[PDB]
Design an enzyme around this catalytic site. Structure first.
Site, short mmCIF file in Angstrom:
data_model
loop_
_atom_site.label_atom_id
_atom_site.label_comp_id
_atom_site.label_asym_id
_atom_site.label_seq_id
_atom_site.Cartn_x
_atom_site.Cartn_y
_atom_site.Cartn_z
N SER A 135 -7.33 -7.98 -66.78
CA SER A 135 -6.42 -8.52 -67.78
C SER A 135 -6.24 -7.46 -68.86
O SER A 135 -7.22 -7.05 -69.49
CB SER A 135 -6.96 -9.83 -68.34
OG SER A 135 -6.32 -10.19 -69.56
N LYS A 161 -2.89 -8.17 -64.84
CA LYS A 161 -2.43 -9.30 -65.65
C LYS A 161 -2.11 -8.77 -67.03
O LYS A 161 -2.95 -8.11 -67.64
CB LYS A 161 -3.48 -10.40 -65.70
CG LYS A 161 -3.44 -11.29 -66.92
CD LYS A 161 -4.52 -12.36 -66.81
CE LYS A 161 -4.76 -13.07 -68.12
NZ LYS A 161 -5.60 -14.28 -67.92
N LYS A 163 -0.94 -9.47 -70.94
CA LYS A 163 -0.71 -10.42 -72.03
C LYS A 163 0.68 -10.20 -72.59
O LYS A 163 1.02 -9.08 -73.00
CB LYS A 163 -1.77 -10.27 -73.12
CG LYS A 163 -3.19 -10.47 -72.62
CD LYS A 163 -3.63 -11.90 -72.84
CE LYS A 163 -4.81 -12.25 -71.99
NZ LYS A 163 -5.16 -13.67 -72.19
N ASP A 189 0.35 -13.51 -68.97
CA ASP A 189 -0.32 -14.59 -69.69
C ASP A 189 0.23 -14.63 -71.11
O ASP A 189 0.28 -13.60 -71.79
CB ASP A 189 -1.85 -14.38 -69.71
CG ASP A 189 -2.62 -15.60 -70.24
OD1 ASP A 189 -2.01 -16.56 -70.75
OD2 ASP A 189 -3.87 -15.60 -70.14
N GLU A 214 1.26 -17.43 -66.84
CA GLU A 214 0.12 -18.23 -67.26
C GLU A 214 0.36 -18.82 -68.65
O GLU A 214 0.63 -18.09 -69.60
CB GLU A 214 -1.14 -17.38 -67.25
CG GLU A 214 -2.44 -18.11 -67.52
CD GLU A 214 -3.61 -17.16 -67.57
OE1 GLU A 214 -3.46 -16.02 -67.06
OE2 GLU A 214 -4.68 -17.55 -68.09
N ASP A 239 -3.73 -22.77 -67.90
CA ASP A 239 -5.05 -22.29 -68.27
C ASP A 239 -5.61 -23.20 -69.36
O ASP A 239 -6.41 -24.10 -69.07
CB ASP A 239 -4.97 -20.84 -68.74
CG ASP A 239 -6.31 -20.27 -69.18
OD1 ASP A 239 -7.35 -20.94 -69.04
OD2 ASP A 239 -6.32 -19.14 -69.70
N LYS A 263 -11.40 -22.08 -65.83
CA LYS A 263 -12.37 -21.53 -66.77
C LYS A 263 -13.53 -22.50 -66.90
O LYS A 263 -13.38 -23.53 -67.56
CB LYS A 263 -11.75 -21.29 -68.15
CG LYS A 263 -10.95 -20.03 -68.30
CD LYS A 263 -10.85 -19.62 -69.75
CE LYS A 263 -9.74 -18.58 -69.92
NZ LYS A 263 -8.59 -19.11 -70.67
N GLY A 291 -11.50 -15.44 -67.11
CA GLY A 291 -12.54 -14.76 -67.85
C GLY A 291 -12.51 -15.05 -69.34
O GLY A 291 -11.49 -15.48 -69.87
O1 8JI Z 1 -11.25 -10.46 -68.29
C1 8JI Z 1 -11.60 -11.23 -69.21
O2 8JI Z 1 -12.82 -11.54 -69.34
C2 8JI Z 1 -10.55 -11.78 -70.17
C3 8JI Z 1 -9.38 -12.41 -69.42
C4 8JI Z 1 -8.55 -13.31 -70.32
O3 8JI Z 1 -7.49 -12.96 -70.71
N1 8JI Z 1 -9.09 -14.61 -70.68
C5 8JI Z 1 -8.44 -15.62 -71.52
C6 8JI Z 1 -7.01 -16.02 -71.10
O4 8JI Z 1 -6.64 -15.97 -69.89
O5 8JI Z 1 -6.21 -16.45 -71.97
C7 8JI Z 1 -8.56 -15.23 -73.00
C8 8JI Z 1 -9.12 -16.14 -73.89
C9 8JI Z 1 -9.23 -15.81 -75.23
C10 8JI Z 1 -8.81 -14.57 -75.68
C11 8JI Z 1 -8.26 -13.67 -74.79
C12 8JI Z 1 -8.14 -14.00 -73.45
MG MG Z 2 -5.17 -17.37 -70.16
#
Ligand code: 8JI
Ligand code: MG
Ligand code: 8JI
Ligand code: 8JI
Ligand code: 8JI
Ligand code: MG
Ligand code: MG
Ligand code: MG
Lengths: 367, 367, 368, 367
Positions: A135, A161, A163, A189, A214, A239, A263, A291
């Protein structure tokens, strides 16, 4: 099994590189770790809350408080305890899924170590390794994103992935698709950053063949996601909204989701996580593991979970060095885009005491 | 481990009294038992098929053949086996759920014994004992039925289930309600013996306040059951139709079922049985455990399963002596309408060799 | 205006009689009060959280923490502040609707007092007094319940609400109906204590002509409430599930509710509470005002809200002496089953300091 | 507060250039203005009716009559009035939303000035300036239109809206798209001029990426709009059909609309207008503010309303110099935006010299 007590440990671990999302840029990860003590032995749980309530309503201090004053006492007062019985015993406490899940994780770790049985065995693993995506957060420039994405592809990650945010969505995707081709597994995402009214703009992502988008809308707007599914072509992935097996069931019944991100902390533990996997499997809905920049403990439990049969998409189960130069456990090292499922009893990993103590900022015993 | 072999054993056990259903009277239960042996130890499984294909397409001889020539060879040929991997390994073989479930039961018994873990722990028990109903067959007269039902109520059973058929439905239920009152948990099971066109007569059961009507129509007429639910008021329970978690998901989506009977052998094993329980729970659908006149082996696994959280109606988990004067294991004795959840490793019960040999009609070793 | 600061005050008030619900028997009410200070003046807010997270995820200590370290600091950093801008400024903090609603209540009190306008004026009141029901908890015996219900009817309350629970449902309702007749406005509240599988037993309530059954199933099981509505006869009322205007809209679209309980703190403030009222009105869904054993402060804001046009069923706006022998504010006295809408600026009420200090267990200043 | 009286005024104002829509060609805007007088002070309201019943059933003469003989007497006869109580007090009078909305507007201005509070404050504004589009009427030639829209784009307007009609639709849109590009925010409004039978032609507008089609079919054909919305791809926006919050609710429930044009006078006042905004917001429906060629009085109230959070599309709140001169301080475009007034009440009032200059009639209804 009788619960003897729980050590709450507050841990601060610095990131190799900042991670920027729709709600902030973080350089250090503050965590909450639980060491449950039973006559059979120790067990470890990890909470996925962060310093503040920016991702969900739960944050580290609030988790620590509710654990110390309600959840841990409630388990200590029970005549008998098992990982499955954790949910009914804490049921009278509304909410706080991440704290409950961390506590259950520690209990299940201890219980399974007492039986010399792994998380993978208990959850029902069918694979010995899992394919891993990465990500990539919001970047300041497009070249900067292309460089990070190329480096992660050179490391062997099998999925990217991105953001995305209002103002940072179609351009990166186009840039990544143009530089790296159409055969790369690519997804985005949004972290609740869009509204149903942004439906035209999100439809601009249809030609790029993403695997999924996402959580475009708010956590509680399930119907809005079902509406958005009619207006775009990219499959919808939920999510933040998937907080229980019942929540996934309802979102599927309403046509609001085609791929589910599981999660475990968010749904209240790995047991509920397996239940979410199972309902989604019964409805023909693919799942993958999410994650939270966890340590080796949560990462190990996540890899175990991710080796289940309905995890047909690479998860956010990156390698340890994607976030930490020094993990507090045996590090998770990418080999051909895969991570090996732990085989030891319990989590298959444990904190290395000297390393854990170097990052421990607080500890308290509840007994 | 690696499966070293399977002892397939055919058993014939006489019933205390004939048991009559819409498809025949059973007086001797012919069963198929499995003893899986691994380097770690032994495990016992029970098949719920009958002598002939009168309840489903599966019967004892056909189960033995498919086990001996396909399923057991396939498991022996795997380098590593776990109870969870039994399903992917036997997936290329279409159908034959009850044989597969028996084989998985034996593998899981061995696996759990190697870890000194009970079925109740692995499946996720939350109760130490389960409340038990009894299933009463079709009788020759109403006074006979009233005497047998009173005898079972005096033994302390907490729910009465009446097998019904065309010509034996409204009258037995009225007789039971008049003789024993409105507080008895009462339900009926038809074993597919009615047709959608018989909907008016089944509506004649509305005033008596039954918990459910079990499998009114055929195995594959799920849509017909949804129609019947629009035409009658007694809740509909599906049995023969519930062959998988996906089958239950689909029947719930179509409004064809409001209470699910989980028969572990029918859905292909106790792992799938837990998945059915979880799918039903996410949709607000209560489940209860179904019986197949099993020995103490299957009865023990059934009690374990019936102690899961969504088994909120008493199951067909009767005592050993309602069917067998002896039984091949330590007997299950009703105490205050409840049966105790086994606590030993694995099934928590094992055959007493003296008794098991007395009732064995054939045995073969496949290795 | 810039917020100059906020005083968080923690208050402990003894109840005239125990109040028992599906999650415990309560003898003392522990509360949070907020005193917002601006250059224009003061404003008061009340948090409806309780001691522990037994009703919702929010509880007093957690509310105080999120207020002290996130919400109040976020507002103090705002250059310009208005009650309406409170929601966007705190939007990045997920959840915590009750704490946010208390803070917004205090900001809105200060703003409206600065403009000489009452809560009733800002919200859109259309009546000068509101009809009041009373909510009676679970009792130990049926005769005790009958006596409490008769006593509350003698005080003039126009509606009776019975807390119901598994095993204490059909019988209390049958008893109340037999002794007091068919013309008493009667309704029940389960506080999530039932399950869709309990649908037959709740159908046993069908003949007694209740106005509503309030929140039979869990908060997040909205589809389950629509399905129960298909199987029973008493209208379904949602309380814990109504946390926003969007939540009410979704429940109405899914056929899960015919009457909505508006708890202003639960939806995150009185502005959102109006929004919920307006959405429900647009769909033909009646609303009524919910209670959380508030002081005179929250009670004043609640009667103001309950004077809006679509509050066509009596709310949980009981009199002060139904819970407290001495309210911290001027008391709310039942008059012919009604309470009068305050007319003063803001809440039209303020704490009487001698009384407030007697029940204050903690106070802290968060400021610039 | 006791209404002391209302001054009714007929105002005739020259437009910068004629404005042509599918229901007529306009050269001078005749309006009706209201001066409410209370002991606390004065307030101004504007009615959006026009000379004849060509846009709706309400027209200037009829609006003045219903106000003079029914609505204003009813308010004068009341002991206490507030802007909120205006709707219940005039409720027994069926219909006449535009007259009631103007009366409410003036009462609310007086009430708000008495509390020295702006319109934006009462409605709940969160922005200090609003983005402004422009509505371009039917022109005689295609190049003629391109000059007009290019001139409006040079002025800095952020959205172009084209009036359409049978014979004036696909071609103007193609011309604007090819001459001015694909990044221009473009939308069209038909003012009920089409039929469901004309659905084929409106499908030809799908390739050009419009934000919406405003009111294609008659005001009362809500089902036909839902039928159309299935058949074409450009979003559907309702205007004339949105006459109340209940009307928007009903259209959303029926899938007839995804964007709502809020005209405060058309829905019966700014209070109802806010309620419409809130209902759409609760359903995920974007709104934007509509114009009726208002003076600075209506323009100020429209800008205030259009600064509420769910106004996520630029409204028809063009600058004063687009139609007029204005009887208040002119509203001058700054970077495509207009500033939300900050004064008490409307934050604007008529300049007597200019108001008298354009006043054709005056009458006092009072005490
Ligand atoms: O690889 C990893 O551990 C991270 C992957 C990730 O983005 N996790 C979540 C999401 O999907 O929104 C998340 C949650 C909170 C802040 C930023 C991201
Ligand atoms: Mg997410
Ligand atoms: O307690 C027990 O084991 C019996 C309960 C029972 O009736 N089981 C099933 C059914 O539901 O049809 C069944 C199926 C086939 C033969 C006999 C019974
Ligand atoms: O009169 C009053 O203030 C109370 C009315 C009332 O019961 N409120 C709610 C509810 O609806 O469950 C409630 C919530 C939490 C505890 C106790 C009650
Ligand atoms: O900019 C402005 O004020 C005008 C925008 C506009 O076209 N308003 C409406 C409509 O949408 O039909 C309208 C109403 C009556 C005549 C002409 C137009
Ligand atoms: Mg059956
Ligand atoms: Mg309630
Ligand atoms: Mg229009």
């Amino acid at each position: 099994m009788k619960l003897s007590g729980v050590e709450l440990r507050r841990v601060q671990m610095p990131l190799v590189a900042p991670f920027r999302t729709s709600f902030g840029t973080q350089s250090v990860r503050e965590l909450l770790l639980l060491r449950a003590v039973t006559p059979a032995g120790e067990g470890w749980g990890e909470c996925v809350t962060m310093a503040g309530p920016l991702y969900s309503s739960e944050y580290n201090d609030g988790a620590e408080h509710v654990l110390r004053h309600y959840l841990i006492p409630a388990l200590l007062a029970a005549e008998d305890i098992t990982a499955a019985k954790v949910t009914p015993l804490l049921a009278k406490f509304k909410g706080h899924r991440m704290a409950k899940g961390a506590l259950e994780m520690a209990v299940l770790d201890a219980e399974l170590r007492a039986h010399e049985r792994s998380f993978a065995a208990e959850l029902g693993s069918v694979r010995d390794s899992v394919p891993c995506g990465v990500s990539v957060g919001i970047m300041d420039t497009i070249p900067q994103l292309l460089d990070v994405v190329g480096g992660y592809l050179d490391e062997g990650y099998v999925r990217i992935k991105l953001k995305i945010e209002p103002g940072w969505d179609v351009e990166p995707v186009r840039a990544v698709r143009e530089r790296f081709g159409d055969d790369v597994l690519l997804q985005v995402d949004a972290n609740t950053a869009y509204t149903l009214g942004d439906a035209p703009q999100l439809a601009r992502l249809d030609p790029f063949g993403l695997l999924l988008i996402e959580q475009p809308l708010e956590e509680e707007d399930v119907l809005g996601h079902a509406e958005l599914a009619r207006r775009i072509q990219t499959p919808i992935c939920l999510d933040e909204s998937i907080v229980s097996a019942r929540a996934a069931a309802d979102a599927i019944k309403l046509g609001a989701v085609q791929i589910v991100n599981i999660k475990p902390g968010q749904v209240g533990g790995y047991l509920e996580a397996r239940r979410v996997h199972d309902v989604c499997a019964a409805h023909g809905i693919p799942v993958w593991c999410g994650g939270m920049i966890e340590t080796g403990l949560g990462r190990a439990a996540n890899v175990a979970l991710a080796s289940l049969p309905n995890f047909t998409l690479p998860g956010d189960t990156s390698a340890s060095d994607r976030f930490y130069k020094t993990d507090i456990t045996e590090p998770f090292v990418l080999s051909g885009g895969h991570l090996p499922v732990p085989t030891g009893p319990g989590l298959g990993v444990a904190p290395i005491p000297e390393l854990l103590d170097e990052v421990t900022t607080a500890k308290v015993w509840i007994g």
